[PDB]
C-alpha cells in the first residue's frame, strides 16, 4: 500500500461492464483498505471485471462476492451495480420470496410437440462459509460433506446418491453433460478470473435422485445449485418437485446449524450479483424455427420478460431450431412470479410458432409489456 489510490486504480477506459460503470476513484479510495471477515477485498471483488472488459453490446456484471459480508462492507460498489443490473433496484427495496408451488396457475399443459423439456434451477450459499471465488479447500469440503450427509436422508422420490467428480470417468462425465444433467469444468474467462475454478475437481460433484428429476450441483458456481427437470411440458410438476425438494433440503441444513444466506434486501445471497433475489432460472427447450427468425421475436422476449439462449438439441449441442427460453428477472419478482412468466410467455410463443407455420400473422397475439 506504498502506492496511492490513483496509482492502483484500474484502467477501465475500454470496459463495458456494470462494475466499471459504477466504480470511481472516491469509492476505490474509501474501500481499497477494507476486508471482510474472510479477508476478501475490493481488488478481489472487481478483478474479474478488470480482466474481462466485456463488449459494448452485452453488459457483464464485472464483480463477485467472496463471502456474505461483501454485500455490506462494499455496498458503495454493489448498490449502484445492483441497481443498474437489476433495473433500478434500490438499496431500500425489499425482495419477496415465494416458494409455495400452489401459487402457480396452470403450467402443466405446455405443448409437448414444441416443448421438449422443462427445467427450474436456483443456487444457494451456506451461512458461515466463504463463496466459491474465495472458499478454501477445507470450506469447499465442508459444503460437500454437508450435502453428502444431508442429502443422504432424503427419501421417496427424493431418494438419491452423490457422485464426486473424482468418481466418474471422463467418459461418464461427458455423457452426463451431454444429457444436460451435469456441469462441465468452467472455461468462461469471467468465471476463471474470479478464482472459482481453484482446486478443481476437488470438492465438486453431483447428487441426484434415481430418476434424475431432482439434482444438486455441489460447489460449482455456488455452494449449491438445485435443479428440477423433465422431458415434456408439465412445468407445474417440475416446479412442484422443485419447491418440495428445496424445502426438504433447507430443513435438513437448518437442522444441521447451517442455513442458506438470505436477507430481506437481496433475497438469497449468491456469488454473482446478477443472480440475487431468487437464484432462479426456469425454462424450457422449445422448437421455434419460424418465430426465432421473426422480426418481432426480439420484441416478444422483451415484453414477456423472457430470455433466450442456446442448447440446440435436447441432446445435441448447437443444432436445430431448439432454443432455451427462460425468465429474465432475478430479484424484484418472486419464484412463483418468475415461473409464471415462463409458463405464460412460453405458452404464447408456441401459439405464435403455430400461426407462423400457417403463414398467418402474429400481430393478433403480440403481448403487452410486463
Ligand X SMILES: Nc1ncnc2c1ncn2[C@@H]1O[C@H](COP(=O)(O)OP(=O)(O)O)[C@@H](O)[C@H]1O
Ligand Y SMILES: CN(CC(=O)O)C(N)N
- CB-nearer residue toward ligand Y: 158 or 260: 260
> Measured between alpha carbons, how far is 7 from 107 in angstroms, rounded to an integer?
56
Using CA atoms, how far residue 241 sits from 119, 163, 246, in Å, is: 11, 21, 8
Q: Binding mask 266-295 vs ligand Y (x if CB under 6 A, - otherwise)?
A: ------x-xx--------------------
Q: For residue 283, report the phi and psi dihedrals to the nearest 5 degrees.
A: -160, 180
Q: How far is the CB of 281 from ligand X (least distance, A)?
A: 5
Q: Is 310 annotated in some ligand binding site?
A: yes
The three-state secondary structure class of 276 is coil
Is residue 60 involved in binding ligand Y (CB under 6 A)? yes
Q: How far is the CB of 229 from ligand Y (least distance, A)?
A: 18
> Measured between alpha carbons, how far is 212 from 197 in angstroms, rounded to an integer?
25
Binds ligand X by CB under 6 A, chosen from 5, 27, 314, 365: 314
User: Binds 8, which of ligand Y, ligand X, its own copies, none (CB < 5 to 8 A, cut-off by type)?
Assistant: its own copies
User: Which has the closest alpha carbon to 46: 63, 66, 21?
Assistant: 63
User: Binds 138, which of ligand X, its own copies, ligand Y, none (CB < 5 to 8 A, cut-off by type)?
Assistant: its own copies
User: Binds 311, which of ligand X, its own copies, ligand Y, none (CB < 5 to 8 A, cut-off by type)?
Assistant: ligand X
Give the number of residues written for the chain. 370
Binds ligand X by CB under 6 A, chosen from 16, 136, 311, 321: 311
Q: What angle do CA 6, 9, 13 make, to 5 degrees?
A: 115
Is residue 55 involved in binding ligand X (CB under 6 A)? no
Q: Is 284 annotated in some ligand binding site?
A: no
User: Which has the closest alpha carbon to 217: 116, 101, 124, 126?
Assistant: 124
**Half-sphere exposure in the Cβ direction for 76 (13 Å, CA):** 13
Binding region for its own copies (CB under 8 A):
2-4, 7-11, 37-39, 43, 47, 50-51, 130, 136-139, 141-142, 166, 192-193, 197-200, 202
The three-state secondary structure class of 117 is strand
User: Binds 60, which of its own copies, ligand X, ligand Y, none (CB < 5 to 8 A, cut-off by type)?
Assistant: ligand Y
- CB-nearer residue toward its own copies: 66 or 160: 66
Binds ligand Y by CB under 6 A, chosen from 27, 192, 197, 314: 314
Q: How far is the CB of 309 from ligand X (least distance, A)?
A: 5
> Measured between alpha carbons, how far is 103 from 224 in angstroms, rounded to an integer?
25
Is residue 325 involved in binding ligand Y (CB under 6 A)? no
Binds ligand Y by CB under 6 A, chosen from 221, 329, 335, 337: 221
Q: Is 32 annotated in some ligand binding site?
A: no
> Measured between alpha carbons, how far is 241 from 93 in angstroms, rounded to an integer?
30
114 DSSP 8-state letter: T
Residue 197 has which C-alpha cell?
475454478
- CB-nearer residue toward ligand Y: 19 or 252: 19
Q: Is 119 annotated in some ligand binding site?
A: yes
> Measured between alpha carbons, how far is 286 from 284 in angstroms, rounded to an integer?
6
Q: How far is the CB of 42 from ligand X (least distance, A)?
A: 26
H-assigned helices in the chain: 5-8, 18-22, 25-31, 42-51, 70-73, 75-85, 137-151, 170-178, 189-192, 235-255, 297-304, 335-357
The binding site for ATP comprises 117-121, 180, 225, 281, 309-314, 324
Binding site for ligand Y (CB under 6 A): 60-61, 190, 221, 272, 274-275, 314
Amino acid at each position: 500500500l506504498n502506492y496511492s489510490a490513483a496509482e492502483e486504480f484500474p484502467d477501465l477506459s475500454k470496459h463495458n461492464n456494470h462494475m466499471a460503470k459504477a466504480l470511481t476513484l472516491d469509492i476505490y479510495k474509501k474501500l481499497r483498505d477494507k476486508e471482510t471477515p474472510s479477508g476478501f477485498t475490493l481488488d478481489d471483488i472487481i478483478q474479474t471485471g478488470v480482466d474481462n472488459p466485456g463488449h459494448p453490446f452485452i453488459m457483464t456484471v464485472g464483480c463477485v462476492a467472496g463471502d456474505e459480508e461483501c454485500y455490506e462492507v462494499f455496498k458503495d460498489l454493489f448498490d449502484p451495480v445492483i441497481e443498474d443490473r437489476h433495473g433500478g433496484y434500490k438499496p431500500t427495496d425489499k425482495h419477496k420470496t415465494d416458494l409455495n408451488q400452489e401459487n402457480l396457475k396452470g403450467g402443466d399443459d405446455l405443448d409437448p410437440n414444441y416443448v421438449l423439456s422443462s427445467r427450474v434451477r436456483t443456487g444457494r450459499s451456506i451461512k458461515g462459509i466463504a463463496l466459491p471465488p474465495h472458499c478454501s479447500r477445507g470450506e469447499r469440503r465442508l459444503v460437500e460433506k454437508l450435502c453428502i450427509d444431508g442429502l443422504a436422508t432424503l427419501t421417496g422420490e427424493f431418494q438419491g446418491k452423490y457422485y464426486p467428480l473424482s468418481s466418474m470417468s471422463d467418459a461418464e462425465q461427458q455423457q452426463l453433460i451431454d444429457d444436460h444433467f451435469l456441469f462441465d469444468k468452467p472455461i468462461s474467462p469471467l468465471l476463471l478470473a474470479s478464482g472459482m475454478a481453484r482446486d478443481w475437481p476437488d470438492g465438486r460433484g453431483i447428487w441426484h435422485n434415481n430418476d434424475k428429476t431432482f439434482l444438486v450441483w455441489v460447489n460449482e458456481e455456488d455452494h449449491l445449485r438445485v435443479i428440477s427437470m423433465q422431458k415434456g411440458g408439465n412445468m407445474k410438476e417440475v416446479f412442484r418437485r422443485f419447491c418440495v425438494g428445496l424445502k426438504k433440503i433447507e430443513d435438513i441444513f437448518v437442522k444441521a446449524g447451517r442455513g442458506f444466506m438470505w436477507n430481506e434486501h437481496l433475497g438469497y445471497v449468491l456469488t454473482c450479483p446478477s443472480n440475487l433475489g431468487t437464484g432462479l432460472r426456469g425454462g424450457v427447450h422449445v422448437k421455434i424455427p419460424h418465430l426465432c427468425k421473426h422480426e418481432k421475436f426480439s420484441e416478444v422476449l422483451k415484453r414477456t420478460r423472457l430470455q433466450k439462449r442456446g442448447t440446440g438439441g435436447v441432446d445435441t449441442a448447437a443444432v436445430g431450431s431448439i432454443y432455451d427460453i427462460s425468465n429474465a428477472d432475478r430479484l424484484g419478482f418472486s419464484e412463483v412470479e418468475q415461473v409464471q412468466m415462463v409458463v405464460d410467455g412460453v405458452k404464447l410463443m408456441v401459439e405464435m410458432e403455430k400461426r407462423l407455420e400457417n403463414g398467418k400473422s402474429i400481430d393478433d397475439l403480440m403481448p403487452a409489456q410486463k
